[PDB]
Structure 1
Amino acid sequence: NRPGITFEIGARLEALDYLQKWYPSRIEKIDYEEGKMLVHFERWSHRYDEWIYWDSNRLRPLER
């Protein structure tokens, strides 16, 4: 039970949207160079996967 980017593939990060919530979304793949992750969302109607960057907008790492 780790709500946030644990930097591990398969970790459940917090993504914002849909409800404007930071909802536990799962990392499917990580790009470390650009610093993006292929995140798979549970509550997401358009697509289910997306490449977004950590805390660039709607992505939150772990508590700290």
Structure 2
Amino acid sequence: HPPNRRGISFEVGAQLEARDRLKNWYPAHIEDIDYEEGKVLIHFKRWNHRYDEWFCWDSPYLRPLE
């Protein structure tokens, strides 16, 4: 089950911020949810979908967009 974290909604189309591979906090959204392994597919706004990434929904590298 997705965890209850402030400012974040674990839903496809939900907006948040994630820390990218270049160690930059950038605006992102949830493209898909893997309820079995507890992961969220993250898409960094205006990036090649080649760099979309799966983050454990408990990752501290995810934060509210506000």
TM-score, length basis structure 1: 0.63
- Pairwise CA RMSD of aligned residues? 2.7
Q: Which residue of 2 aligns with 1:15?
A: 18
Q: Which residue of 2 aligns with 1:25?
A: 28
Structure 1 residues without counterparts, runs of 5 or longer: none
Structure 2 residues without counterparts, runs of 5 or longer: 1-6
Q: Which residue of 2 aligns with 1:5?
A: 8
Aligned length: 59
> Greater share of helix residues, 1 or 2?
2
Q: Aligned AA for 1:60? A: R
TM-score, length basis structure 2: 0.61
Q: Matched residues, percent identical?
A: 68
> Which of these residues, 56, 59, 62, is aligned with residue 62 of structure 2?
59
- The Cα of 1:61 is off from its aligned counterpart by 4.8
Secondary structure class of the residue paired with 2:30 = strand
> Which of these residues, 25, 31, 42, is aligned with residue 39 of structure 1?
42
